[PDB]
Amino acid sequence: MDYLRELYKLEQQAMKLYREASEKARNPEKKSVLQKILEDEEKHIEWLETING
Amino acid sequence: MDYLRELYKLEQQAMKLYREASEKARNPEKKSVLQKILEDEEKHIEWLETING
Ligand SMILES: [Zn+2]
Ligand SMILES: [Zn+2]
Secondary structure, X not given: OOOHHHHHHHHHHHXXXXXXXXXXXXXXXXXXXXHHHHHHHHHHHHHHHHHOO | XXXXXXXXXXXXXXXXXXXHHHHHOOOOOHHHOHHHHHHHHHHHHHHHHHHXX
């Protein structure tokens, strides 16, 4: 029952946290560790769009 | 600076939702599409534990 926007929005609230965290985490150690989670979340967001209708 | 807990919690609020989404997604087509998120999305928590302090 009407449950998929609830998943996707929390899914993108992490991606948007990951943008702002990247501004603070500008050091190359963390900037190359949160980037792999960012690319994994962009993968989920692609599939979430493919599954939306 | 100490934002890592805030990211992990929103990362786990999707995961706690996803724990129940898997029951409504009992159909095996869906249960092999949200499953690849679940395996990636547990992986973030796995690295976040190594990042914690
Ligand atoms: Zn995700
Ligand atoms: Zn994640």
